[PDB]
Amino acid sequence: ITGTSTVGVGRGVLGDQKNINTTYSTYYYLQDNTRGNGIFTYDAKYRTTLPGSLWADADNQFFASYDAPAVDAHYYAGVTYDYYKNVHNRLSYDGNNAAIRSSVHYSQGYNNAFWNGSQMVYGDGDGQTFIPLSGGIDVVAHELTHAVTDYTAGLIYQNESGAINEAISDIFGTLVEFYANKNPDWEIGEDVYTPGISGDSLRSMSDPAKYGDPDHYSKRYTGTQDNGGVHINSGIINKAAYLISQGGTHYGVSVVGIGRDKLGKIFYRALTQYLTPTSNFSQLRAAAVQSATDLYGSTSQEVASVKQAFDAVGVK
Ligand SMILES: CC[C@H](C)CNC(=O)[C@H](CC(C)C)NP(=O)(O)CNC(=O)OCc1ccccc1
Numbered sequence: 001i002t003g004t005s006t007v008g009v010g011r012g013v014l015g016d017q018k019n020i021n022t023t024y025s026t027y028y029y030l031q032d033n034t035r036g037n038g039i040f041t042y043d044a045k046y047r048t049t050l051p052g053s054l055w056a057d058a059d060n061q062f063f064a065s066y067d068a069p070a071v072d073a074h075y076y077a078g079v080t081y082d083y084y085k086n087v088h089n090r091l092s093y094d095g096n097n098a099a100i101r102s103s104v105h106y107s108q109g110y111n112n113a114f115w116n117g118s119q120m121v122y123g124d125g126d127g128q129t130f131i132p133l134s135g136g137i138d139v140v141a142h143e144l145t146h147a148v149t150d151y152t153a154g155l156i157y158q159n160e161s162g163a164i165n166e167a168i169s170d171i172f173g174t175l176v177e178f179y180a181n182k183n184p185d186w187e188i189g190e191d192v193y194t195p196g197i198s199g200d201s202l203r204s205m206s207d208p209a210k211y212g213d214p215d216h217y218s219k220r221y222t223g224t225q226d227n228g229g230v231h232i233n234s235g236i237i238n239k240a241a242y243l244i245s246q247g248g249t250h251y252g253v254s255v256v257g258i259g260r261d262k263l264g265k266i267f268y269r270a271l272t273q274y275l276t277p278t279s280n281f282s283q284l285r286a287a288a289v290q291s292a293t294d295l296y297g298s299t300s301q302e303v304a305s306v307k308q309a310f311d312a313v314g315v316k
């Protein structure tokens with residue numbers, strides 16, 4: 001909407017206060033004009049029609065319980081935008097400052113979040129498996145990263161390409177979490193998963209097997225559930241990424257860590273220059289090796305570490 005840029009204040013899902021960029025025209029709207037062609041957050045009002053209505057508020061204060069998922073979807077979309085722009089020189093998900101749209105309060109008791117081809121969508125959870133999912137910065141960045149993937153590599157959402165698609169979202173979700181630097185970790189969704197259970201998470205990148213996800217190609221799922229295991233086999237690539245960054249010895253194979261920033265550069269380049277819609281795990285290894293070669297040189301530690309990590313997870 002046309003209006004003037006304003007700064008509201010509110011509380012997120014976890015009870016933390018933050019400032020949010022809004023737009024004033026009669027109401028204060030969750031419309032951040034400070035980034036690209038805007039970040040827009042919508043109320044789906046417990047229904048499944050999308051996007052719903054652009055979030056309107058009378059006083060620019062967002063401290064109601066109902067406001068919390070909107071505050072976080074809006075704010076964490078901003079952090080994710082900043083990560084891609086500042087770290088990778090990428091302007092929004094399409095590289096041309098496309099407007100970023102999110103809807104919260106999607107459906108009832110909805111234990112998921114997704115990119116629907118055009119926008120991000122967040123359930124509130126059922127209060128048992130999840131609380132409102134936009135409360136996780138890794139979750140928000142995971143969703144926006146699906147848009148990035150769809151505009152770039154275009155990895156088909158099934159089987160190996162789909163597991164790469166998933167891992168890319170977990171990797172960048174995690175790198176954005178580290179970028180914001182509030183309780184960062186290599187776990188996925190810990191801030192919004194299972195409020196009655198401390199210390200767990202939806203997935204682990206550092207040890208995928210702790211939740212039954214494979215950490216080696218020989219343990220990959222080959223059935224038809226979950227689009228051929230896209231949220232399961234992602235563990236193999238998540239583990240490789242974790243090893244590239246942090247190092248470790250895994251099934252007897254030692255990997256020298258090169259740090260998060262270099263992991264991000266290598267995978268961003270692979271995603272945007274080398275991967276295609278049908279890339280499999282072996283082709284991802286080749287893409288990562290070539291990306292590291294471009295960035296650091298064929299004889300570099302970075303290239304050697306990429307090879308070690310994929311060796312460790314059984315991907316040749
Ligand atoms: C394995 C269970 C979990 C909840 C699956 N969902 C997830 O891992 C994450 C959310 C996490 C980060 C909290 N959501 P996601 O974006 O991967 C859900 N994906 C999914 O809905 O795709 C299916 C889809 C939807 C719309 C258009 C085309 C395809």
Ligand SMILES: [Ca+2]
Binds near residue numbers: 058059060061062063
């Ligand atoms: Ca208000």
Ligand SMILES: [Ca+2]
Binds near residue numbers: 177182184185190191
């Ligand atoms: Ca965390």
Ligand SMILES: [Ca+2]
Binds near residue numbers: 177
């Ligand atoms: Ca996390």
Ligand SMILES: [Ca+2]
Binds near residue numbers: 193199200
């Ligand atoms: Ca929990």
Ligand SMILES: [Zn+2]
Binds near residue numbers: 142146166169
């Ligand atoms: Zn996903």
